[PDB]
Design a protein around this ligand. Structure first.
Ligand code: PLP
Ligand code: PLP
Lengths: 402, 402
C-alpha cells in the first residue's frame, strides 16, 4: 500500500478534474498530517479553512459519534429535535432572525441568489425575471453553472455551455464601480467576499466593506457576504466584516462550520428577506440533518470558547511580520488577515510556486499554489506560537534553498 | 423538551422553506423511528430513499466511527488513501471507466450537465455555448438555479430570477417527443429519471428506456440517467435501467450511497466523456473526502451482500398486490417498482392526502404526500415480510377509517 499506487490508481479509476500535490495523506490530528509512509507534515492549507479547529478535533468527533448512534437523517419532510437547536444557536450567535441550512458552499450561494431574486420581485418590485445580481471580479463561490457564470477565471467557465443571465461583474475593491452598477433599479443584490481567497488572498483596502454597505443600503440592494472561507475565526473575528463593524443583509457560512467532519453550510439573514421563500419553494435532502447539526454546534462551540479568533489574529500578526523579513527580490508581496495569508513569488523559468510547494512538502509543510506565483499559508487555528515559528523556519529553509 | 416546542422554535429561528408533517423524530434504527415522546413509527419515506439500508445501519456506523478517528477531510488539493479505494470499488461495481465524486444530488446533476456540454464542444463539435440539454417534463434533480430552470413545477421556479438557457423540456414517457427533440444537432444530452419519484412515482411504459438509449445513440446524444433516488436496490436492481438491460452514457447516484450518514453523490461515465474535464476545471471541497468514501463503501457493501435488491423486489410485489385490494372508489391507482410505490387518492373536500398522512401518523406510520392526492410508500429495504404486512394493516386501518 504505497503512495505511487494511490496516485496511479486514482488516475485510472477517478476523474481527472484535479491536479493535486503528490502526497497521500492517511492520518490527521490538530495541525499535523501523516502520509501512508509515516512522514509527518505541517498542514498550512486547512482544507481551504475547512478544518480551522484542526483535524479531528475531539469535541466534534464525540458529538458525531454520539449522534450517529441515535439518528442520522429523517429528511425535512418531518421534524427532528436537533435542527432547530442548531438554528437557534447559530442565529443568536451571529444575531440574525433566521438561518437556512444547506450542505455545501455552492448551495449556500445558490440559496442567497434565490433569496435575493425572490426578495427583488416580492419586496423591491422588480418586473419578474428582470432582476440582476452583481459579483466582484475574481470571485469564487463554487463551481455550479450559476457559480461559474459569474466567474472571470477561464478554467472555471470555458466550455461549459451557455451562461446564467442576470449576472453582472464589477472589479473587486472598487467603490465607484459598485456605485455605477447599483444605479440600475433591477439590481437586487451584490455578492462579495470580504477577502477573495481563491484569487490569491486579495485583501481590499480599509473602508471598502463600509462603503459597500453604504452603497447597498442607499440604493436598496442586498449586501451578500460570502464568509464560507473567510468567516469562523480564521481572519481573527467571527466574520471578516466584523473588522469594519459592517452588518451584511445576507451572510454565508461553510467549511469550518463542521471542522471537516460533515458538509454543513448556512445562510443567515433577517425575516423580511428570509420569509420571501414560502414552504416547499427551496430546500435540500441532507440540508439540516441532525448529525450535521450536532457537529455544527460542536464546531461553533469549540470555535468560541477555545479562543481561536484572537489566537489566529496574534499568530497571523507574527506570521506576516516574519514572512516580510525574506528579501524583496524573491518574495514580491506578503498579504493577509488572521491566519489567512499569502505570498507572491517572483516567478521565472528558474522556479515557480509549484516547485516551492514540492520542496516544502519535502521539508514537512503542505501548501497550495493558486496561480503559479502565489502561495497561501493557512494553518489550523489550534496551532501555537512555537509550532508556528517552527513552521516558518521550514518556510524560510525552503525559500532560501533556491 | 416537548414536540410543540420544537415546532414553534423551528418556526421562529428557522426558514419557512418547508411544511413538514407534525412529528419530531429523535431516534431511528432499521425501519423504525421514535419521536421525543417515545412513540414508535414505521418509516415509509426512507428520507426519500436515502436510508435504504435502514436508519443507522451498524456496518456503516462502524465505518464512520473508524474513519473519524483517523482522517476526515484533506481537500482534493492533496491525495488521500480512501477516495481512490471507493472510486475503484464503485467503478468496478457498476462497470464504468471513471467516477466523479460530489456531495449532494444537485452537484451530481450539475456535474452531468457540465460533462455533457464540455463533451458536446470538444467531441461532438457543437459551436461553443450553443449546446442544449433535454429534460423530461415533471423531472426533479434538485433545487439550484439550473435545476429549477428545467422544472415544470411552479413552486420550484416561480419568482427565482431569469432562467438557464439551453434547457429544453419534452413530455415524460414519450418516444416521439424525444425523437423530434434529438433532431437538433446542438442537443448534447438528454437527462431523465427511470422512475420520476418527486412527481408521484410516475413509471414509464415498458421499453421506454430501451427506446431512449436507441434514440440517444442514433442521434449522438448522451443518455443521462438520474438514479439518485431510483438506484441502489430500491426498485429491485442496482439501477432501475437494469430492468431493461440499458447502459446509460452517464449515471447519477446519491442519497442511499451513504445510508443517510453523509452527503455523498457520484457521477459514473466512461473515459471519452469523463476526461473532457481537465484538471482544475471542476470539483468540490468536500467532494471525495475520506470519511464519506468509507461510509459509501460500507453502504454499497451492505447493499450488495445483505441481499436487498431482490428483497425489495419481492416485498414490493407483495406491497402492490396488497394495496390493489382496497376499493377503486377511494384508491384511484396503485403504481411503483420494488419498494418505491405510490397510490392515488380520490381527493374531495371530505379528505385529502395530507389528512391521511396525519391519521397514518396517529396509527404509527409516516408517509409523504406529493400533490394532495398522491401518497408514496417507500420503507427501508431491510424491512421483512411480517413487518411489511403489519405496516400494510396500518395502511388499510387508516384508509378504511374515512
Ligand atoms: C465564498 C465561497 N463559497 C463557496 C466555496 C466552495 O464551497 P463548496 O466546495 O461548494 O463546499 C468557497 C470555498 C468559497 O470561498
Ligand atoms: C434524481 C434526483 N436528483 C437530485 C435529487 C436531490 O438531491 P439533493 O437534495 O440535492 O441531495 C433528487 C432527490 C433526485 O431524485
Amino acid at each position: 500500500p504505497t503512495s505511487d499506487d494511490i496516485f496511479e490508481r486514482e488516475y485510472k479509476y477517478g476523474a481527472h478534474n484535479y491536479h493535486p500535490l503528490p502526497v497521500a495523506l492517511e492520518r490527521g490530528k490538530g495541525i499535523y498530517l501523516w502520509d501512508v509512509e509515516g512522514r509527518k507534515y505541517f498542514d498550512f492549507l486547512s482544507s481551504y479553512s475547512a478544518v480551522n479547529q484542526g483535524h479531528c478535533h475531539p469535541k466534534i468527533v464525540n458529538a458525531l459519534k454520539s449522534q450517529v448512534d441515535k439518528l442520522t437523517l429523517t429528511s425535512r419532510a418531518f421534524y427532528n429535535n436537533v435542527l432547530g437547536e442548531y438554528e437557534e444557536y447559530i442565529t443568536k450567535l451571529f444575531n440574525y432572525h433566521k438561518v437556512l441550512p444547506m450542505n455545501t458552499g455552492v448551495e449556500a450561494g445558490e440559496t442567497a441568489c434565490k433569496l435575493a431574486r425572490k426578495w427583488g420581485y416580492t419586496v423591491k418590485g422588480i418586473q419578474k425575471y428582470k432582476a440582476k445580481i452583481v459579483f466582484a471580479a475574481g470571485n469564487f463561490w463554487g463551481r455550479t453553472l450559476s457559480a461559474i457564470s459569474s466567474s472571470t477565471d477561464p478554467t472555471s467557465y470555458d466550455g461549459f455551455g451557455p451562461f446564467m443571465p442576470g449576472f453582472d461583474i464589477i472589479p473587486y475593491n472598487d467603490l465607484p464601480a459598485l456605485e455605477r452598477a447599483l444605479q440600475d433599479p433591477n439590481v437586487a443584490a451584490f455578492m462579495v467576499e470580504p477577502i477573495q481567497g481563491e484569487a490569491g488572498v486579495v485583501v481590499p483596502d480599509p473602508g471598502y466593506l463600509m462603503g459597500v454597505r453604504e452603497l447597498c443600503t442607499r440604493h436598496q440592494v442586498l449586501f451578500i457576504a460570502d464568509e464560507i472561507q473567510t468567516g469562523l475565526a480564521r481572519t481573527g473575528r467571527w466574520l471578516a466584516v466584523d473588522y469594519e463593524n459592517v452588518r451584511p443583509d445576507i451572510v454565508l457560512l461553510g467549511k469550518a462550520l463542521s471542522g471537516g467532519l460533515y458538509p454543513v453550510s448556512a445562510v443567515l439573514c433577517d425575516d423580511d428577506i428570509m420569509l420571501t421563500i414560502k414552504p416547499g419553494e427551496h430546500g435540500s435532502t441532507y440540508g439540516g440533518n441532525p448529525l450535521g447539526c450536532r457537529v455544527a454546534i460542536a464546531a461553533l462551540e469549540v470555535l468560541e470558547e477555545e479562543n481561536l479568533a484572537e489566537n489566529a489574529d496574534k499568530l497571523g500578526i507574527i506570521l506576516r511580520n516574519e514572512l516580510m523579513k525574506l528579501p524583496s527580490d524573491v518574495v514580491t508581496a506578503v498579504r493577509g488577515k488572521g491566519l489567512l495569508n499569502a505570498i507572491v513569488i517572483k516567478e521565472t523559468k528558474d522556479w515557480d510556486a509549484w516547485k516551492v510547494c514540492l520542496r516544502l512538502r519535502d521539508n514537512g509543510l503542505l501548501a497550495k499554489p493558486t496561480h503559479g506565483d502565489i502561495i497561501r499559508f493557512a494553518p489550523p487555528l489550534v496551532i501555537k506560537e512555537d509550532e508556528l515559528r517552527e513552521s516558518i523556519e521550514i518556510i524560510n529553509k525552503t525559500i532560501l534553498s533556491f
